[PDB]
Amino acid sequence: EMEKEFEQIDKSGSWAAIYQDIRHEASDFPCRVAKLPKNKNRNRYRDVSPFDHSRIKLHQEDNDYINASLIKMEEAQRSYILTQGPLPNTCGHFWEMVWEQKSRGVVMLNRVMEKGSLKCAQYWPQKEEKEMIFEDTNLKLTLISEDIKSYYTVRQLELENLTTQETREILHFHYTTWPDFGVPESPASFLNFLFKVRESGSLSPEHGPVVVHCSAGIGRSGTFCLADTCLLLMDKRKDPSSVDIKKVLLDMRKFRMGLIQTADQLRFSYLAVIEGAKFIMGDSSVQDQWKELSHED
Ligand SMILES: CCCCCNC(=O)[C@H](Cc1ccc(OC(C(=O)O)C(=O)O)cc1)NC(=O)N[C@@H](Cc1ccccc1)C(=O)O
């Protein structure tokens, strides 16, 4: 049981030791294409790269590389694309990936600037009347509307392939309150957001994989995907107590390195899965509880 494990670890002050063990047991796979000198300007951080076996390939003639990985969770029957926050020169590639992979939703877990430092490029339009054109990948992006809440904003974007004139509606789910240091005090806001993303239809199997990112696409993004997958498994096994969060995280780590960046994010992932479990288990009023607890106004 994850609840019993959570407490044993918590009371013995062993989060750092459990996290250290996950880092040590994690898979090691080649990072070859990401390290090619030609791709240096496509990586935000030199120590965060997609493995060759699961990297997303752009359907680009000259260079198919993007720092993004396909996390294919077999048992949970869900796939996620985790990528770094796009750089000024990779915003076109980012939207190209979204188009090619047929993604319906984009989940952003950070702010463009945090503690005075740039963490992600301004890749979507902030004003309806000032659309963005990505010349390199021949894409047009327009802000259609935006619903700003106290801890997240949901935007309706229109992505157009200028080559075929085909148009698609992309939903942008932006968590705007991750703390400058550490992790949120409570997982209520994070869970309300996760369920808003589920409710939108963006994680459905009829669409391509949701695109999730933070700055490196491994810590906050890993937290979001780990919690979602754990919750899916708990609803699928129907005996949620067999879900081993450490084992789920290690399967996810076969697809992208360093998912879950600190012991505090691991602890927070347990907290979010344990609390989300209360809804999955049957509490029909707990979703309203997070709605209020997260104080969306
Ligand atoms: C798990 C591997 C990461 C280990 C520590 N690295 C760093 O913090 C960063 C990479 C990094 C990893 C996770 C992060 O997550 C947070 C976020 O996305 O906001 C979050 O989840 O809140 C943010 C950054 N790397 C550099 O800062 N890289 C620098 C310094 C550096 C130079 C040479 C070698 C390694 C690092 C660079 O120039 O690329």
CA distance 191 to 183: 14
**CATH code assigned at 98:** 3.90.190.10
261 close to ligand 1 (CB < 6 Angstrom): yes
Residue 192 CB-half CA count within 13 A: 23
Three-class SS state of 173: strand
Domain region containing 166? 1-297
The owner of tokens 């990072």 is 31
41's tokens: 């300007």
Distances (CA, A) of 113 to 43, 178, 245, 281, 283: 18, 12, 31, 38, 38
Using left for φ > 0, alpha for ψ between -120 and 50, and beta otherwise, residue 217 falls in left
Would you give the distance in Å from CA 183 to the centre of its chain? 15
Distances (CA, A) of 46 to 40, 41, 128: 8, 10, 35
Q: What is the whole-number distance in angstroms between the Cα of residue 83 and the centre of ligand 1?
A: 14
On whether 269 is known to bind a ligand per the annotation, the reply is no
Q: Which residues of 147-163 are buried (b: 16+ CB within 10 A; e: fewer)?
A: eebebbebbebbbbbee
Q: How was this structure determined?
A: X-ray
Question: Which amino acid, 151?
Answer: Y
On whether 214 is known to bind a ligand per the annotation, the reply is yes
218 close to ligand 1 (CB < 6 Angstrom): yes
Query: What residues contact 46, with CB distance under 8 A and at least 6 apart?
Result: none
Catalytic residues: 214
Measured CA angle at 15 (ends 14, 21), to 5 deg? 90
- Of the chain, the end-to-end C-alpha distance in Å amounts to 35
CA distance 130 to 62: 30
Please tell me what DSSP assigns to residue 155.
Answer: E
Question: Which amino acid, 42?
Answer: R
- Residue whose Cα lies nearest atom 15 of ligand 1: it is 219
On whether 220 is known to bind a ligand per the annotation, the reply is yes
216 close to ligand 1 (CB < 6 Angstrom): yes
CB 94: neighbour CB atoms within 10 A? Answer: 27
CA distance 195 to 210: 14
Strands 139-148 and 117-118: unpaired
Choose one of 20, 23, 45, 259 to mutate for the ligand 1 pocket test, by most ligand atoms within 8 angstroms of C-beta.
45
DSSP state letters, 268-284:
HHHHHHHHHHHHHHT-S
Q: Which atom of ligand 1 is nearest to the CA of 215?
A: 18
Backbone angles phi, psi at 230, to 5 degrees: -60, -45
Question: Which amino acid, 217?
Answer: G
On whether 230 is known to bind a ligand per the annotation, the reply is no
Would you give the distance in Å from CA 169 to the centre of its chain? 19
Q: Which atom of ligand 1 is nearest to the CA of 219?
A: 21
Would you give the distance in Å from CA 275 to the centre of its chain? 19
Q: What is the whole-number distance in angstroms between the Cα of residue 244 and the centre of ligand 1?
A: 27
Q: What is the whole-number distance in angstroms between the Cα of residue 279 and the centre of ligand 1?
A: 34
CA distance 162 to 133: 9
174 close to ligand 1 (CB < 6 Angstrom): no
CA distance 286 to 297: 18
Contact 208, 103 (CB under 8 A): yes
CA distance 193 to 97: 24
Structural domains of the chain, count: 1
